[PDB]
Amino acid sequence: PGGVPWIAIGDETSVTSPGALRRMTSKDIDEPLVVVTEHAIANFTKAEMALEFNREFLDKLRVLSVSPKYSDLLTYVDCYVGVSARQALNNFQKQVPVITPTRQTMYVDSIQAALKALEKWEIDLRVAQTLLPTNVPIGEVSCPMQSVVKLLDDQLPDDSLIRRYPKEAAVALAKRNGGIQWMDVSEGTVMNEAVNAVAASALAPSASAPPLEEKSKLTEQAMDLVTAAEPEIIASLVPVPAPVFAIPPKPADYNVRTLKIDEATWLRMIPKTMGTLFQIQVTDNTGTNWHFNLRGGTRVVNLDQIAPMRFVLDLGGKSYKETSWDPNGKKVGFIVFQSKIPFELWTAASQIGQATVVNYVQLYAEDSSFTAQSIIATTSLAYNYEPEQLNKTDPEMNYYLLATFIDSAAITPTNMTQPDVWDALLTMSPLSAGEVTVKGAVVSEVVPAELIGSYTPESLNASLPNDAARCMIDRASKIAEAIKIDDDAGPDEYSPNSVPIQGQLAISQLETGYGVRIFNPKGILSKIASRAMQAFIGDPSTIITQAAPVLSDKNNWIALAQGVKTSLRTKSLSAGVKTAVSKLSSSESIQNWTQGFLDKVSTHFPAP
Residue 121 C-beta: closest distance to ligand BOG, Å: 12
Q: Does 253 bind a copy of itself (CB under 8 A)?
A: no
**Which member of 19, 101, 157, 166 binds ligand BOG (CB under 6 A)?**
166
Strands in 425-430's sheet, in edge-to-edge order, are 252-254, 425-430, 309-314, 381-385
**Which member of 82, 333, 440, 453 binds a copy of itself (CB under 8 A)?**
82
CB-count burial class (<10 Å; 0-12, 13-18, 19+) for 116: exposed
Distance CA 84, CA 45 (A): 28
Comparison of 170 and 436: residue with beta carbon closer to another protein: 170
Question: Which residues, 387 to 406, sit near a copy of itself by CB under 8 A?
Answer: 388
Comparison of 287 and 523: residue with beta carbon closer to another protein: 287
Distance CA 315, CA 329 (A): 13
Q: Does 149 bind another protein (CB under 8 A)?
A: yes
Q: Does 162 bind ligand BOG (CB under 6 A)?
A: yes
Q: Is residue 586 within a helix (H) or strand (E), and if so which, with residue range?
A: helix 577-604
The CA radius of gyration of the chain, in Å to the nearest whole number, is: 36
Stretch 524-553: interaction string toward another protein, x if CB under 8 A: ----------------------xx----xx
Question: Which residues, 377 to 406, sit near another protein by CB under 8 A?
Answer: 383-384, 389
Distance CA 454, CA 545 (A): 6
What would the 3-class secondary structure string for 469-490 be?
Answer: HHHHHHHHHHHHHHHHHHCCCC
**Which member of 186, 273, 286, 572 binds a copy of itself (CB under 8 A)?**
572
Residue 355 C-beta: closest distance to a copy of itself, Å: 22
User: What 8-state DSSP symbol labels residue 258?
Assistant: T
Comparison of 136 and 352: residue with beta carbon closer to another protein: 136
Question: Which residues, 128 to 157, sit near ligand BOG by CB under 6 A?
Answer: 149, 152-153
**Which member of 219, 398, 534, 552 binds a copy of itself (CB under 8 A)?**
534
Distances (CA, A) of 496 to 499, 545, 563, 583: 6, 24, 8, 21
Distance CA 267, CA 258 (A): 11
Stretch 449-478: interaction string toward another protein, x if CB under 8 A: ---xxxxx-xx-------------------
With CB cut-offs between 5 and 8 Å by kind, which of ligand BOG, a copy of itself, another protein, none does residue 289 bind?
A: none
Distance CA 378, CA 400 (A): 24
Stretch 93-112: interaction string toward another protein, x if CB under 8 A: --------x---x-------
Question: Which residues, 33 to 72, sit near another protein by CB under 8 A?
Answer: 35, 37, 39-40, 43, 46-47, 49-50, 53
Distance CA 267, CA 530 (A): 41
Q: With CB under 8 A, what is the number of residues at the site for another protein?
A: 121
Question: Which residues, 325 to 344, sit near another protein by CB under 8 A?
Answer: none
Comparison of 45 and 373: residue with beta carbon closer to another protein: 45
Q: Does 55 bind ligand BOG (CB under 6 A)?
A: no
Comparison of 86 and 340: residue with beta carbon closer to a copy of itself: 86
**Binding region for a copy of itself (CB under 8 A) out of 277-285, 337-345, 400-408, 571-579:** 571-579
Stretch 563-592: interaction string toward another protein, x if CB under 8 A: ---x-xxxxxx-------------x---x-
Question: Which residues, 205 to 234, sit near ligand BOG by CB under 6 A?
Answer: none
Distance CA 149, CA 425 (A): 61
Residue 90 C-beta: closest distance to another protein, Å: 19
User: What 8-state DSSP symbol labels residue 25?
Assistant: B
CB-count burial class (<10 Å; 0-12, 13-18, 19+) for 326: middle
Distances (CA, A) of 8 to 15, 24, 173: 6, 9, 53
Distance CA 261, CA 378 (A): 26
Positive or negative, the Cα torsion across 366, 368, 373, 378?
Answer: negative
With CB cut-offs between 5 and 8 Å by kind, which of ligand BOG, another protein, a copy of itself, none does residue 298 bind?
A: none
What 3-state class would DSSP assign to 576? coil
In the complex, the residues that contact ligand BOG under the rule CB under 6 A are 149, 152-153, 162-163, 166, 169-170, 173
